[PDB]
Swiss-Prot record, chains A, B:
Amino acids binding adenosine 2: 411
UniProt-annotated binding residues for dATP: 142, 152, 428, 431
One GO process term, biological-process aspect: GMP metabolic process
Binding site for IMP: 50, 52, 200, 204, 213, 247-249, 290
Domain of life: Eukaryota
The protein, known as: Cytosolic purine 5'-nucleotidase
Amino acid sequence: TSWSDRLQNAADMPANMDKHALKKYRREAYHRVFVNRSLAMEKIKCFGFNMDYTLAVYKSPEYESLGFELTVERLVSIGYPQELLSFAYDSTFPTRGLVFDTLYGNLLKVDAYGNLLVCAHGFNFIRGPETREQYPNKFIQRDDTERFYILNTLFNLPETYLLACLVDFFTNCPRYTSCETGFKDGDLFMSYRSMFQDVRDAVDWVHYKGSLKEKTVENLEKYVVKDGKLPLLLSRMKEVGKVFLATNSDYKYTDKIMTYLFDFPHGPKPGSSHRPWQSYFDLILVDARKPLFFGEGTVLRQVDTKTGKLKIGTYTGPLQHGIVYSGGSSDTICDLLGAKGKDILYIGDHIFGDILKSKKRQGWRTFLVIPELAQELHVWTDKSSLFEELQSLDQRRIKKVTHDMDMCYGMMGSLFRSGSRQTLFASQVMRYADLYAASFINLLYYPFSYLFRAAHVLMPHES
Amino acid sequence: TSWSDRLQNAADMPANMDKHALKKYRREAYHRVFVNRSLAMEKIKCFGFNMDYTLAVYKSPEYESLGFELTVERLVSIGYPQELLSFAYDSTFPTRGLVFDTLYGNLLKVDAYGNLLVCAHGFNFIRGPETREQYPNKFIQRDDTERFYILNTLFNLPETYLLACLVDFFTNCPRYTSCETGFKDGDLFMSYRSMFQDVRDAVDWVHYKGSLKEKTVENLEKYVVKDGKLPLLLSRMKEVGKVFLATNSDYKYTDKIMTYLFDFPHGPKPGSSHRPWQSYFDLILVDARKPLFFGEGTVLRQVDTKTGKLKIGTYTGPLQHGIVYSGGSSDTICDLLGAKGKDILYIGDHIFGDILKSKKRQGWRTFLVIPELAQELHVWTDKSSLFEELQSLDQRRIKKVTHDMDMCYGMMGSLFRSGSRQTLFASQVMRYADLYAASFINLLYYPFSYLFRAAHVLMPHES
Ligand SMILES: Nc1ncnc2c1ncn2[C@@H]1O[C@H](COP(=O)(O)OP(=O)(O)OP(=O)(O)OP(=O)(O)OC[C@H]2O[C@@H](n3cnc4c(N)ncnc43)[C@H](O)[C@@H]2O)[C@@H](O)[C@H]1O
Ligand SMILES: Nc1nc2c(ncn2[C@@H]2O[C@H](COP(=O)(O)O)[C@@H](O)[C@H]2O)c(=O)[nH]1
Ligand SMILES: Nc1nc2c(ncn2[C@@H]2O[C@H](COP(=O)(O)O)[C@@H](O)[C@H]2O)c(=O)[nH]1
Ligand SMILES: [Mg+2]
Ligand SMILES: [Mg+2]
């Protein structure tokens, strides 16, 4: 039972829109919208969406496995050893939001301050005392973004596991000698840094020049969660505001995926005529290049929707019906929709590129979709007696229970914590996502003008 | 009754070290250490101090007035009009942590997200609707550190008030024409940006080449809070750990100020021999250049304590008794004291340069001294019925009460909030200062191995 299984189960349910059934549905944590900072929905004039892992949620572990296989095949084709071909994706190893340290080849789970919560070299979990050889203060400098790479997205799950696989492989293969910062193979030295760059380049290649998109599209049911409730929610949003799409992907892929997401024998609800996905949006923008999009962005272009190619030149004209934009900046959306940032609720899955950057750079209201929350709530609920025991105790009893708690989620523990310690991801969700949920669909269960409320915060001296 | 009056009152009290009197004293908010993140004092091996506004707390409003007069005199001497000479410091205008917008000439009080809480152009407080002409989203981009200057320290109070004075003066003087981004004087255009740079340069000059230090030292009782309890606390810290000083000031000034702070007819307690201030520190470091100090720093130098000049060359030797260092980096302290960052509690008043940077860059434990908390607690306590009314209501009743609440603190409101909205300063204290208090002296009231406890934080879905 993966998190995507939970999501597809809820996707298969039709919307009962009776005002009392709606209120009772959003009782269950799976269907709730969680609130970090208060948000009056009545004040939202534009709803903005990301596509990948927001509107288009890819099924797990099938899609991660596909990305993993194609990345591995790319590395073998550029010269990596044949043994890579015997790796197989394991969804129980990676948790999202890990930090790869390119100096020492470790995956790290850290808190908001760079304190080490978990350290794995290959599949070898480094316990407290031994991590002090490499991390004397059990701490990393987060501002050292050249050394440390944060694996923010579900697209990073395959490389998270692959990095550990590769480190495990070269360490244990007797054709290589292990050094502090990489591997010797006779007269060739491969640093963990160049190994990571090869993996990163290979993932990029698979997305950009490889066959991931082609393979996805030739089996959409296998790879993509589909929900009849999506057209209904979008169409209700359009009744009270403007709706826009801003994706880092290209038009041709967006068009294939979005057509699939709206492919039902009806429109917003059963019995209504089907309408093209594009009709649900006041503005469609592809090749966004987020987060640069929230800074200077790039030159605004117009897509030729017939050929899927860009028209030559910068687009200088106004918003017209049926136009599709490419590139531009968040100011494009504001200018064209007549919107200020706080009038916008932007719904995304990328904590850095969608959420943190739109908040800091533009003062947009934010909604973070966390697909794994589907499963994480189940574990949180039915394993709460473990956490409660931990909360009670607050020494090597603490270490044992922290471990058992964590193991329930996988080898790298919960997305949100290690025992009583919150992860960097958890703190960034709290700091930057005004609202969050397992799915944006949970907005369907809240009335037109709901007021999401979070308690006022007091400083220690104010209590 | 200024905040420094409150502090000097407590300074005049002798330490009653009876274990029950200590426990009862730290009941009162004035004498408490507040806790943002848990800290086991037993784990602290080195206590580090800043000098200015930490150990040496300058009396208010006398010291701010002195800085203000000397800055004004510097501006007049470089060509600013004679009318500046009739300005007089007003301690009721500035609150610390305001943001000067160099584009439009406004002082802004903002929250952690760049949302506008207060906007003053000169002495003209811009209400909601009118701020939208210049701030369409009632929001500033905090990452635009070229446009926005955050007035973090008590040293910035004189320029905070002076900036408002200057904008008020040129606006109302008919020899100048007001434009969006500054003032016309015939064929001369002075932008608010160049005006701010002149003020900034003039403050720097007063500190570096002017007579502020000379004037301070020729009247120390007038300008500097003195406390018999300081030698006692330092000497108790030295019993269980190492103690160090890291100041951005120069040796000669540090030596004058520190001699004064320890000038009592006794040592740690009445009846004990007086000892030189330097004897209380295992390591003394001047010209620190914080926050650069917490990055690459500068070359480590040795002070010639006879002449007050630097010895020629980089100091390559070991920690020796009686040596005084200059420049260097935070790694100097760790290497010389055999300390890891989490073994260090660093006590400072600069939220950015002492606290935020030592936390993020080095994983130091942090203690923020907030001198105004002395007065702010009094207002918080005896005006709590106003805040409580506000908390109850949570529309133009909200606006009225927010205003009346704020006015109790001064024209720019509390350091920590505007009504129910927390300031950027408040959020940075919570995020970056593990402990905080009105004075570092409050540590005297806590046992050798106290455990400061903050409640574990839960995400909305975890509650
Ligand atoms: N998940 C992720 N994956 C990959 N990368 C990620 C990531 N999350 C974050 N990053 C990037 O990692 C680097 C370090 O991250 P962080 O350490 O997270 O920077 P921050 O979250 O924004 O904290 P800070 O309180 O200083 O920020 P603020 O907006 O207040 O500061 C705004 C500006 O004002 C300055 N500033 C802030 N407070 C100040 C003060 N009190 N005085 C003077 N200057 C101040 C700051 O130095 C800054 O220049 C950054 O480049 C960040 O964008
Ligand atoms: N080149 C590259 N593209 C990525 C990577 N991760 C996600 N993408 C692309 O980002 C797009 C998703 O954008 P979204 O709709 O989420 O803004 C997809 O086209 C996907 O292929 C990556 O690691 N490298
Ligand atoms: N040049 C300059 N020096 C300052 C300014 N503010 C504080 N200082 C200096 O900083 C030193 C205080 O450093 P601390 O002991 O607080 O680290 C003092 O010498 C003081 O003159 C400023 O705005 N400009
Ligand atoms: Mg996405
Ligand atoms: Mg200081």
